[PDB]
């Protein structure tokens, strides 16, 4: 993600319609889950490292 674009997105837009996520660190505008605030690969890596208190693999 381009730093200039990230900074512009962080800035306050002149219209409310121009608000979008832009996953925080990697700046990926796509494949991001709202509550987490992180994209698919970010979630994968952080969960595998165990940095979030409560996510874990699935087997039911």
């Amino acid at each position: 993600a381009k730093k200039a674009l990230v900074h512009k997105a962080n800035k306050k837009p002149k219209f409310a319609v121009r608000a979008y996520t832009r996953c925080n660190k990697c700046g990926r505008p796509h494949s991001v889950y709202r509550k987490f605030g992180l994209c698919r690969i970010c979630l994968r890596e952080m969960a595998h490292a165990g940095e979030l208190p409560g996510v874990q693999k699935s087997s039911w």
């Binding site: 690969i41 693999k57 699935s58």
Partner: peptide, 20 residues
């Protein structure tokens, strides 16, 4: 929550995360 294996396709195999 369901996430793909890796970016750039290879999406056939998936896995799930729960939030207990």
């Amino acid at each position: 929550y369901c996430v793909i294996r890796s970016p750039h396709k290879y999406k056939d195999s998936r896995e799930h995360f729960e939030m207990r």
